[PDB]
Design a protein around this ligand. Structure first.
Ligand code: NAP
Lengths: 246, 240
């Protein structure tokens, strides 16, 4: 099992894509730290399901937009298990509104969490991973970042910023063999980034359906665990049903 | 002259690229509002040069990371000429450091200006251009936002974000015929820049060259059908 004796930290893992990722990394042998901010009951469920299928997991509370909370988050993982092999930055929110009506706090809270959180957690991971001379970071971005989407100037700015950040961090950490990649989901059935745009655009998803959380989790597991993915870095993989090919 | 009787606001226009863009948009006929953050003299030097070319310009002090100052910036332009045809989001800064040692304040100051300022100014511009049913927004991004660059996790995440914002804003404003586009310079000779073997054309770009692409998007009738795009002006540095 490719992640036996490895540690994964997944941010915003109480539900949807993040929950699915936590499960798939555990399935593949990792001990998973399941981070949440408010969904504690759901987060406990994720730990219980990992325990149930034979793995090890624990839930850690932390608001990933907050610099000292991120410090305590990583400190808790190293204290429990001594190392960090895989970080998946998945935590994010939407606060949809046309730009004209977009209030500054709807811009800021999306930027601070979706982009700032990736910065804070990538910084903390880099320290530990540079010391190990190994690691893989996977950031969940989103096709909205590549193509834009009415109502979502904050979300798309953030997810595009996550893609740029991904590439810079790939270049800084490459000399130690640390890989840094992004997975860009399209519209996923149960973790829908824009429920309103899915409807309008279902007609032009070439595969004719929404994606599943478990599918996004597989591309993530591949990037995190497959030896072939040791040579992939600074990339964005769309899993979007052919939504964005350009 | 394609910009006669049109009004342009250029943020960060006291020096370098922003200066060359303000000069160029003025030579194409526009009244230009010259935003600066603290260079009152350099700003007025640009205003002066526009006036000796026989143009109209005025300077406005505003830190475009600040909600309340951008609002003041845009009110002062509307109050003076009663319209806004072209916004060029140019102001930006760097705070280079490897990720390992990047301080939270150095992340946040680049993000607040280079990305937050683009949100604030494009929001003020959307309000006006929606009412006009015309306008052009041009954002100065950077090829470093497309390919990443060690030392610049903050600047590249901010410039990549400008590119994503550009696309969403383009889609929101398209139905009234407003174009929204980005121009991504590579390495240009400026204060921000004061080996080379990776630029196929074998030289840095000149600030005037960036200014020509901006003017083209801002003024040329063919650019009415260009929106949601990023044009690299980078000597071949990044071919994508
Ligand atoms: N190779 C390059 O130079 C390169 C490559 C790609 C993209 N770009 C982008 O091009 C744009 C212009 O860069 P440049 O090289 O011309 O810059 P550079 O000469 O430093 O000039 C910066 C300008 O923006 C202003 N500014 C700084 N902080 C501001 C704030 N908070 N609010 C409003 N204005 C502020 C400065 O005004 P003051 O004089 O009052 O401080 C000055 O006018 C930036 O977005 C930059 O990131 C440059």
């Amino acid at each position: 099992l490719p992640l036996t004796d490895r540690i994964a930290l997944v941010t915003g893992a109480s539900r949807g894509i993040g929950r699915a990722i936590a499960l798939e990394l555990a399935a593949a042998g990792a001990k998973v730290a399941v981070n949440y901010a408010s969904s504690a009951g759901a987060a406990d469920e994720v730990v219980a399901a990992i325990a149930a299928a034979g793995g090890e997991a624990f839930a850690v509370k932390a608001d990933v937009s907050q610099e000292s909370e991120v410090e305590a988050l990583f400190a808790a993982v190293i204290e429990r298990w001594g190392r960090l092999d895989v970080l998946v930055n998945n935590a994010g929110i939407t606060r949809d509104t046309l730009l004209l009506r977009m209030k500054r706090d709807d811009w800021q809270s999306v930027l601070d969490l979706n982009l700032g959180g990736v910065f804070l957690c990538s910084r903390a991971a880099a320290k530990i991973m540079l010391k190990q001379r190994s690691g893989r970071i996977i950031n969940i971005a989103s096709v909205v970042g590549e193509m834009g989407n009415p109502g979502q100037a904050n979300y798309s700015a953030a997810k595009a910023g996550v893609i740029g950040l991904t590439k810079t961090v790939a270049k800084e950490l490459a000399s130690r063999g640390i890989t840094v990649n992004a997975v860009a989901p399209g519209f996923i059935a149960t973790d829908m980034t824009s429920e309103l745009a899915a409807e309008k655009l279902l007609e032009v998803i070439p595969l004719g359906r929404y994606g599943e959380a478990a599918e996004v989790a597989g591309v993530v597991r591949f990037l995190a665990a497959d030896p072939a993915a040791a040579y992939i870095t600074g990339q964005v993989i769309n899993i979007d049903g052919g939504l964005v090919m350009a």
